[PDB]
Design a protein around this ligand. Sequence first.
Ligand SMILES: [Mg+2]
Ligand SMILES: [Mg+2]
Ligand SMILES: [Mg+2]
Ligand SMILES: [Mg+2]
Ligand SMILES: [Mg+2]
Ligand SMILES: [Mg+2]
Ligand SMILES: [Mg+2]
Ligand SMILES: [Mg+2]
Ligand SMILES: [Mg+2]
Ligand SMILES: [Mg+2]
Ligand SMILES: [Mg+2]
Ligand SMILES: [Mg+2]
Ligand SMILES: [Mg+2]
Ligand SMILES: [Mg+2]
Ligand SMILES: [Mg+2]
Ligand SMILES: [Mg+2]
Lengths: 220, 87, 25, 182, 144
Amino acid sequence: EEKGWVPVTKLGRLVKAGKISSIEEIFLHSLPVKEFQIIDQLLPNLKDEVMNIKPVQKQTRAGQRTRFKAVVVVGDSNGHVGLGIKTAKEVAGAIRAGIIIAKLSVIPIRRGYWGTNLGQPHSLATKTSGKCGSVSVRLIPAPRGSGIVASPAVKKLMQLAGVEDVYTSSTGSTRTLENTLKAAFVAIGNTYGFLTPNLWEVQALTPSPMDVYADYATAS
Amino acid sequence: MENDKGQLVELYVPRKCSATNRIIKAKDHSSVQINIAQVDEEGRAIPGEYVTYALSGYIRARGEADDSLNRLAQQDGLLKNVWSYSR
Amino acid sequence: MRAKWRKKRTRRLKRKRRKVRARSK
Amino acid sequence: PRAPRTYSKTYSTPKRPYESARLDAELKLAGEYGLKNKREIYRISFQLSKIRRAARDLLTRDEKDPKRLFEGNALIRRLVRIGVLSEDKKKLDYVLALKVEDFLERRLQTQVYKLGLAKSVHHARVLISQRHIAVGKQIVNIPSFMVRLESEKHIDFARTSPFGGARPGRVARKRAAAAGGE
Amino acid sequence: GKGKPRGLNSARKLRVHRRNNRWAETTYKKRLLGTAFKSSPFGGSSHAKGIVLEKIGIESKQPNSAIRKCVRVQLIKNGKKVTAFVPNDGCLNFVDENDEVLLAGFGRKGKAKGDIPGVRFKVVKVSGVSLLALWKEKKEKPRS
RNA sequence: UUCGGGUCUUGUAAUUGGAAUGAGUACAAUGUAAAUACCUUAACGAGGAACAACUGGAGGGCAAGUCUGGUGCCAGCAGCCGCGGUAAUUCCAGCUCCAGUAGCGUAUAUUAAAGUUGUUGCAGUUAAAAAGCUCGUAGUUGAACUUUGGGUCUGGUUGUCCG
RNA sequence: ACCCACUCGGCACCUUACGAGAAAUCAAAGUCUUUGGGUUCUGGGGGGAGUAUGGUCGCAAGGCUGAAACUUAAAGGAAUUG
Ligand SMILES: [Mg+2]
Ligand SMILES: [Mg+2]
Ligand SMILES: [Mg+2]
Ligand SMILES: [Mg+2]
Ligand SMILES: [Mg+2]
Ligand SMILES: [Mg+2]
Ligand SMILES: [Mg+2]
Ligand SMILES: [Mg+2]
Ligand SMILES: [Mg+2]
Ligand SMILES: [Mg+2]
Ligand SMILES: [Mg+2]
Ligand SMILES: [Mg+2]
Ligand SMILES: [Mg+2]
Ligand SMILES: [Mg+2]
Ligand SMILES: [Mg+2]
Ligand SMILES: [Mg+2]
């Protein structure tokens, strides 16, 4: 296709120059991503599918002005998820911008073992939870190959995550798909927010990629 | 974190706050990483050699960022008696 | 309707029923 | 009053009856292996779930515990004797990793298909149903039969069957009689 | 921290509190009071026979304009009278006056279904034969 | 070079062939106290293989039609939301399709869903719900403190290095 | 009697979310799916209904206790745009 992608931010300039090789460097230093093309460059195989299209109306003096809210989940099934929620006039544009936001909001997840680690991680590391609106989602580790015991939206979010086995429990008005998916997103991103005995030792604070490679930014 | 044979399966072993030992989230868009330049005998800032402190977004939001940095710099011999361990 | 006036109407129905019972007690 | 012998269910219909992806997967598995109904996949999933409940219960117990040893190695030896679990992964942690397709694969239907004496899966189903394949001189008219490793080498057409060598059968005998008469 | 007691010797009040709160439900209260046996047209009965008294149709609710063709039936088991609904296009004519009819539940836990007011019972069989067999002309009324 | 052989395979056609087999009948024999019935098996027993599989549904929940004709807020359907007012994806039919399948549909009861009984594990400012307030028997609960250390020997069990 | 500093107790108040909520908002309505300091009372969709009945208190007014039959797909809370 046709894509030039002139980089307008320093992170984008470094990525376009090919100086950042893995998305782990972006996630580690809590770097701010504002160009989805960075995420496209780092993760070439981010699959996605629209969770829901919802018509939302505003009551004006003349008729009812209706837009559409698209709930898109993007991921690579290898420990990377993003949840975009967008509102727009035309449904196709709403889906495109929701994909854009979801790519912007990619996040890493910490898959773990239920017990007696043998192969690659199959489940989460610990129990995690999130709460959006009144919807509280509780993700609990499950034994190997136990499937994803979750509602279809949460199940498909875990599938996009790469988590193959997990138990779930949702409390509240899980009816609303955006709230449920946001709570699940909060939980799965909180999976890397739990300090664990195997994460106890301190590191040397490797210098930030835009400090060591500040020269290649700042287009002169 | 560790596979049974002994190879790492974790990705991006995360940083931790240098003042509260709490990990830094990937999307913790309040946290900062300060660099303090090493100084040689005649006061010339040696380039490319410094010391880094990762301050979390939580302490910055609370308002204890500057105090924590004061203590942390005093411990590693940067500032003279700027922070007293007994308030 | 107000709960006050529904209460009062119930009280007046009890008025009539209590007088009737007192007549026939 | 005589002591009852216990009948018991052997399948469990799923909770969500109209899951599109699940229905498509069930139809894929039914067409791949010539299953008559979708109760077959329910039965294999129920067997997998019983095995898996046992496996997880034994996993919960402490390592080097007599219950763990005895029942775990009993289950592993039974499954490797069936053939679904390869000898490489006799560990009781890969036993959780078995899928329904693994037990589907060990059916006498698919085994007759693999050996090549039946060139089609539905051909294997009918050939089994017509009392032709005998697993060690014993005719088996039952498609599933959970063929085990120690006896797979003894699948062939039965002697009473025309394929194993006998009188041909109704159609061919009648045609031979008609040709001899005229 | 919470309204309930938490001590190791507080089983008695926890149990009696649960027992007193259970009456707030409707299913538990119905099951324990035995309201179904005493007050409902059938006492814990899924089906019940009866005799047709008259042949009436009742108008529907506001959003739905029609007249649903029902029938008033006096129950034989105890003598109560209830309206019941004959479910299909041309089944009203099939049931005749003063014949035994087997009424069933209406599927909404003994409550009026849809737009039909003051009815709670279907009609499954008439004069020994089922409505569904008559409607597709698989069997015919014996006309006795 | 347009081709196009179909070079390599996979379906659709009332075309078309050769097979196999029971569901049934039935010499027998086995079976049984005697008989059925099952296992075996003579002789018959499949071409539309009429030896013909139904039960519900096709707006959403919920897999599958905005095809055709009929009726026109009628008839009726609809567990709930709803369809029916002259172009009905919902009623009555035909076609196609979907789900389970020798089973499927309904009714009541009940369990999981129900973190809508909440001990684990519910809520009480306004959604239902803090007695008007205080004392008080029973009930429930109730501050801290009374030998903690060490040294040796020694027995099993492990992971040790190797015999 | 004021002024400055501190402390205990009380009616209160401003800012803020780094916590909690469906939010309006709360410095408690926080320390609650990372769920357990002790303890009492109350609620299980709306209506019928705080009605009838049965007790009990009152001279009376009425107070306390207090359903069901039946009916209904909502009633209701906060906030957003008109
Ligand atoms: Mg009318
Ligand atoms: Mg049909
Ligand atoms: Mg129909
Ligand atoms: Mg139709
Ligand atoms: Mg559908
Ligand atoms: Mg039409
Ligand atoms: Mg509640
Ligand atoms: Mg109010
Ligand atoms: Mg209130
Ligand atoms: Mg109060
Ligand atoms: Mg006491
Ligand atoms: Mg004590
Ligand atoms: Mg109520
Ligand atoms: Mg009231
Ligand atoms: Mg009284
Ligand atoms: Mg309001």
